[PDB]
Amino acid sequence: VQLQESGPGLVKPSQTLSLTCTVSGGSISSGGYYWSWIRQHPGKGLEWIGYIYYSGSTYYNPSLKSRVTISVDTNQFSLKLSSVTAADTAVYYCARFGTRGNTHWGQGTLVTVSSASTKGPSVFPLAPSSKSTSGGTAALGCLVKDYFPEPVTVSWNSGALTSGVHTFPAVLQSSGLYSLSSVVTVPSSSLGTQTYICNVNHKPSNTKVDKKVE
Amino acid sequence: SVLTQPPSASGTPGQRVTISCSGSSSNIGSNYVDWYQQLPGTAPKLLIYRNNQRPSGVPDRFSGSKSGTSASLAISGLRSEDEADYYCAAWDDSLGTVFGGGTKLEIKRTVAAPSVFIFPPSDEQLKSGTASVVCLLNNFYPREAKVQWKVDNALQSGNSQESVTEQDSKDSTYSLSSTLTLSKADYEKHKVYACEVTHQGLSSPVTKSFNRGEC
Numbered sequence: 001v002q003l004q005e006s007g008p009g010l011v012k013p014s015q016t017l018s019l020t021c022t023v024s025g026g027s028i029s030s031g032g033y034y035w036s037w038i039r040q041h042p043g044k045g046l047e048w049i050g051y052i053y054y055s056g057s058t059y060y061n062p063s064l065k066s067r068v069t070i071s072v073d074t075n076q077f078s079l080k081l082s083s084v085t086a087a088d089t090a091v092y093y094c095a096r097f098g099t100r101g102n103t104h105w106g107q108g109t110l111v112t113v114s115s116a117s118t119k120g121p122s123v124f125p126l127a128p129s130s131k132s133t134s135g136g137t138a139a140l141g142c143l144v145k146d147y148f149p150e151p152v153t154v155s156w157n158s159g160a161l162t163s164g165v166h167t168f169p170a171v172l173q174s175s176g177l178y179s180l181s182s183v184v185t186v187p188s189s190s191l192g193t194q195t196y197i198c199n200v201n202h203k204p205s206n207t208k209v210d211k212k213v214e
Numbered sequence: 215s216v217l218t219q220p221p222s223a224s225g226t227p228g229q230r231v232t233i234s235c236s237g238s239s240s241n242i243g244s245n246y247v248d249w250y251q252q253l254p255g256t257a258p259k260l261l262i263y264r265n266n267q268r269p270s271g272v273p274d275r276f277s278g279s280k281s282g283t284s285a286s287l288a289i290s291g292l293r294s295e296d297e298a299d300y301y302c303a304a305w306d307d308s309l310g311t312v313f314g315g316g317t318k319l320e321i322k323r324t325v326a327a328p329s330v331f332i333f334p335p336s337d338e339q340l341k342s343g344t345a346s347v348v349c350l351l352n353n354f355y356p357r358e359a360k361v362q363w364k365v366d367n368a369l370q371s372g373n374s375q376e377s378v379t380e381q382d383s384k385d386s387t388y389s390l391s392s393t394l395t396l397s398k399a400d401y402e403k404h405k406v407y408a409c410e411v412t413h414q415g416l417s418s419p420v421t422k423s424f425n426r427g428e429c
């Protein structure tokens with residue numbers, strides 16, 4: 001089974017958060033499986049939201065029971081959390097908890113509760129120089145500056161380069177905007193021929209930039 | 215917070231570590247404990263269920279135990295890919311499913327000094343009126359590192375932000391990005407920009423500097 005979350009990365013305060021979990025590789029009509037919602041505040045622990053059984057019986061986190069509805073559609077199930085505040089900013093996971101040990105989690109999706117405006121990121125190349133090269137190994141990267149909200153996804157050469165790649169946790173500037181840098185160490189021999197592109201994606205503002213890093 | 219875990223744990227490669235989980239009669243004492251492994255940047259995964267059962271794809275290096283209101287997860291042959299947050303979980307008879315605060319597992323590899331790299335502000339950023347200078351501390355251990363910015367050989371402060379990655383699943387090292395942000399006017403008034411790096415893997419502080427416009 002595979003589980004896929006979907007929803008907005010940004011939600012206004014007091015609005016209702018609606019998330020759906022698309023199930024693939026099996027139906028939602030045979031126990032004993034507990035189709036779950038779990039959330040995780042950024043860089044922190046886990047909090048259970050609720051379970052739903054194929055019969056339709058639900059169990060909720062008592063601290064969220066008054067605000068939460070989990071429902072099954074006639075092959076999806078959803079989470080609706082009303083009257084959201086900044087305290088509800090977290091990564092939300094949908095999962096399939098099996099009583100016989102076959103548990104699968106979804107990838108998780110980040111929800112930021114804020115009234116602030118959405119801003120697209122600027123993408124600047126961190127060009128490799130002699131001050132970025134040591135022992136035949138050269139460093140280069142991209143600077144993803146002044147955006148809101150999280151997250152931005154950075155890949156190198158359409159997902160090719162994975163080794164040596166370091167995408168740092170975004171920092172919250174004085175701007176109120178997030179700043180991020182993504183770097184990769186490559187052989188110095190390949191700086192003149194092999195192309196290195198900075199693939200930056202930011203859905204909340206529709207920003208897709210492919211940066212030739214020179 | 216309903217279940218109690220130590221915030222951190224550590225062990226050398228090949229050695230064994232145990233992670234405790236303390237609960238009460240209403241959760242651990244009444245039911246069973248599950249364990250979840252969260253690799254950095256990934257969703258949690260089931261590691262242990264029903265106190266000590268392993269799902270498919272989990273090596274026998276991992277084992278769990280439960281006694282009374284306590285539980286314990288053991289990792290026998292520590293690998294670099296074992297670095298993760300480990301959460302115990304249990305059904306509370308009143309609260310439902312509760313978690314522990316989680317335990318970050320650190321692998322004690324050998325001391326590694328960072329490779330230091332510096333990046334002048336790009337010309338496209340300079341068009342915006344801002345100037346960011348990035349200092350890169352790459353693949354080092356332990357985590358503790360100190361960066362000191364120099365501008366025209368003068369020490370800076372309060373004008374930089376730094377960011378650190380999680381421990382790398384393959385070489386057990388950390389990387390650090392330090393970014394100095396100046397106005398374009400500030401940037402052009404000065405001549406030299408330097409990044410001074412202190413780390414126990416270094417016999418003495420390392421400086422990566424550049425004059426404006428070189429290379």
Ligand SMILES: *[P@](=O)(O[C@H]1C[C@H]2CC[C@@H](C1)N2C)c1ccccc1
Nearest residue numbers: 034051097098099245246304305311
């Ligand atoms: P597990 O923690 O609890 C099982 C016994 C009781 C309490 C919840 C549910 C399942 N119920 C029958 C568990 C196992 C699978 C999924 C969620 C929780």
